[PDB]
Amino acid sequence: KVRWPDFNQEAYVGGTMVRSGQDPYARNKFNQVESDKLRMDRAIPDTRHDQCQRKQWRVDLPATSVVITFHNEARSALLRTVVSVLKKSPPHLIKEIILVDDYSNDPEDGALLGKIEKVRVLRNDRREGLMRSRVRGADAAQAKVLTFLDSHCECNEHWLEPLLERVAEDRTRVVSPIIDVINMDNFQYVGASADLKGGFDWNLVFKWDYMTPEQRRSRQGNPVAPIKTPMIAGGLFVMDKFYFEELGKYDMMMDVWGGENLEISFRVWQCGGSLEIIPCSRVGHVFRKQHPYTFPGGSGTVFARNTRRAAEVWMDEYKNFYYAAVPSARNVPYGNIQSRLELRKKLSCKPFKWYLENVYPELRVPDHQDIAFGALQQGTNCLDTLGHFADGVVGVYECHNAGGNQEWALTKEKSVKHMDLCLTVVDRAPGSLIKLQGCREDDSRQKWEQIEGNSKLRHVGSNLCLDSRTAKSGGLSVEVCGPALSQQWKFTLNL
């Protein structure tokens, strides 16, 4: 058994260093060369608000079992995660660190770390996935409070106490830190916007949401108050162990791919708990995507088993908006869900409509008689008002997934509508720019239709199609329909 300061980092990282000529990003989608240059206990800046430094905690806060699942992690990053926990946490609050090695190619990545004080290693004999692995770690846990971390994190100053203090006060709170960013290229540790929290669109993939004006006003008035959130962000949360068990742990029929925070966030909120972000708790994390998952695309299928298991149990009739967004999922097998249905019945949970109204009212729900909804996409761009009002041109702009000027519907009256403005064919000559004008129910100039498997938008009663070829020249136009890239448009939801 070795105390973490005596652990031989250079021998552990060892023969796994990147050779010259090898892709530094190959092991786990971040730059391993730079990860390997850091020490295991490298200093990081204290990104907490100044008020957080004036907080004191009882010595009798409940200890936690920290459960870290991993699969083919970069050794330097896995070791720095473990050391961060040990270095930054009051030792008495760390009952144990349980590493659950989810069938990594080399079992030494984990086994060598089991020499460290407090570190226990459980190795799965096949790839089970994060959710099943977390259940294994949780069943093995000795403490009364579970802490789940991912395998490429770095805990900051007094990260743990604020989380435990919330759960010790009310066992129904499931709580997370603010996630700071560890850059995937250069490994610098920095803070992100304080006005971002976890969310999702009807495709049910995680996204960052920008707080509304009310929420931002509220945050300004106390930047260290706990923040309620509709969806856990990241790999990271603390939960009373008995509450985790009572609520149904994780669904053990989930597989490797996607959905890790979806089912649990719905279940916690619907079945009477809550999700919080705790600003005085900071943990940095290496995010590995540069862009959102593309939809349409293959991800909708890759994530469908786990996503359907969430939607079919929890979402009631709202699952239909998910299938509107991800029609490729509609027929993907997802296994029997009777026991999870039984759990929901046993726990007396609220309907999804209640979740939408009380927990996530910012998720906008299509009108009952909308034909299509969401954003109107063309490649990675979206139909956009460019901030214009009546008589202004419309445009196209990089899809930002933030709603706003990119929020549209195709209404029962066949209009393409944003707030009370509608796309209007003010001039039928081919080439002419279209304009935003007030929606009027019987204006033939404002009628559009999806054509060709919902891949274009034609002006009803015409051979004119919406066309971005004029976007450099002033905005979108009507153009003679033809086989042009600039005439491809598709709503994210087809109802």
Partner: peptide
């Protein structure tokens, strides 16, 4: 492992 995720940002202009 976790499901790879985007770095925390949003649109850089306002609605």
């Amino acid at each position: 492992g976790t499901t790879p995720s985007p770095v925390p940002t949003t649109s850089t202009c306002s609605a």
